[PDB]
Each structure stands twice: as structure tokens, then as C-alpha cells.
């Protein structure tokens, strides 16, 4: 689909940036790659791994909530608390409400509510100090297409092209968007900045972003190969 397409584009963009060896310059000018306009519309603010039994629950920065169940289906609740979207394994979408929800989705809705009640009670909101970009009035939410965990990070792939990598050891985060061809870096101090990948290639960047972008390349290749 266009999803597969966006993974190829991200991979190419990362390969280009990394090939330029951005941290190896006469004078690194990372500030010149800053593009605050390119801040993402959506990222994952919280998640709960219950994949031993049901799947992975998460919340987007707009306070909407989703589940990617172990059967590769997705249920997403809008931040109005009533609008629902069910996505089947092959991507087929159905628009529903918790008011008029099909009986067949009883168990999954109950699980979504379990996750919803847990997250609004337990976890920090990633990028809480970040004001999202925009998107149009009555737009539909993206859903989690896939995720996996490594020793170093959890990798999250949204259906709108965005790949998020949260690093476990120091809580640094990357939000990558092929559409904007940009990367948002959240430092260990929860400070943040959005960079145009083409300008990072032009002007360079610090070792810690460069390193994380190398790992990001490896991760996006893994998403594509699977």
C-alpha cells in the first residue's frame, strides 16, 4: 500500500543522512536544520505491553487511545470518548460508536477500556511539553500498524507513515516522518527539536542524534523486511 511506500521513503531518507556521516564535519551546524513547522501531528504518548494475553494499548498525544491486539486488529477510541474505529488485519476500516458498537466487539471494547483506565492513571505523557502540528478539522486518526521491542528500544509504526523509537535506558525518543522528511528528537532532559533530514545531511548533527539515527535506520529496515 502507501504504507509500504512510506517505509521505503523513510529508509532511503535515513540511508542518505547516515551516508553523509553528519557528525563528522569541519563545523557541525545542527541548529541550521531546525524546522519547528515540521513538528508531528501525532505521536505515541503512553503505551502498555499486555501482549502476553491481548496486545498493546497506547495513547496518542491528542489523548485518543488505541489497541493493537495480538490478532493484528486495531480498535481506536477518539478523544471525544464515543467515536470508534475498528481496523481488521488487512487494513479494512469500520467507523463505529461506543453507543452503537456491534456486539461482536464486546470483549475488545472492554479491553480498550481496561487500557484506557490504566494509562490515564499510571504513566507520564511523552512530549507533554510539545504542541502538536495541525491537520484538518474532522480528520481520521491513524492506527498502530505494528510495533516491536528490542533491548535498546520500543519501535512504533503508525499507519500515517510515522515511526517512533523510544529508547529504554535514557528515555530519549525519535519521531520520524517520511512525509515531512523530518525527525523530532526528545533529549534526556525532555527538551525537544524537529529537524529536516535533508538539512541534517547538509549541516550535520551531534554524536547522540547521529547515533540514534543510525539505529533508526536499522529499525526501519527491520520493519520493511518483515
Amino acid at each position: 500500500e502507501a504504507i509500504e511506500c512510506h517505509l521505503s521513503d523513510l529508509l532511503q531518507q535515513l540511508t542518505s543522512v547516515n551516508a553523509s556521516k553528519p557528525s563528522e564535519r569541519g563545523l557541525v551546524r545542527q541548529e541550521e536544520a531546525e524546522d519547528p513547522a515540521c513538528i508531528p501531528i501525532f505521536w505515541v504518548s503512553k503505551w502498555v505491553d499486555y501482549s502476553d494475553k491481548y496486545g498493546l494499548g497506547y495513547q496518542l498525544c491528542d489523548n485518543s487511545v488505541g489497541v493493537l491486539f495480538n490478532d493484528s486488529t486495531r480498535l481506536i477510541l477518539y478523544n471525544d470518548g464515543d467515536s470508534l474505529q475498528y481496523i481488521e488485519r488487512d487494513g479494512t476500516e469500520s467507523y463505529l460508536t461506543v453507543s452503537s458498537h456491534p456486539n461482536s466487539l464486546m470483549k475488545k471494547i472492554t479491553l480498550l477500556n481496561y487500557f484506557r483506565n490504566y494509562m490515564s492513571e499510571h504513566l507520564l505523557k511523552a512530549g507533554a511539553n510539545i504542541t502538536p502540528r495541525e491537520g484538518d478539522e474532522l480528520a481520521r486518526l491513524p492506527y498502530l500498524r505494528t510495533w516491536f521491542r528490542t533491548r535498546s528500544a520500543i519501535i512504533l509504526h503508525l499507519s500515517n507513515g510515522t515511526v517512533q523509537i523510544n529508547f529504554f535506558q535514557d528515555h530519549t525518543k525519535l519521531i520520524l516522518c517520511p512525509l515531512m522528511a523530518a525527525v523530532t528528537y526528545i533529549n534526556e532532559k525532555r527538551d525537544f527539536q524537529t529537524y529536516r533530514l535533508s538539512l541534517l545531511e547538509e549541516y550535520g548533527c551531534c554524536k547522540e542524534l547521529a547515533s540514534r539515527l543510525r539505529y533508526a535506520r536499522t529499525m526501519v529496515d527491520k520493519l520493511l523486511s518483515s
Binding site: 503512553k46 502498555v48 505491553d49 499510571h122 504513566l123 507520564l124 511523552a126
Partner: peptide, 5 residues
């Protein structure tokens, strides 16, 4: 197993 507390 969750995101950051």
C-alpha cells in the same frame, strides 16, 4: 510492562 512512569 509499560512506558515511563
Amino acid at each position: 510492562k509499560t512506558s515511563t512512569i
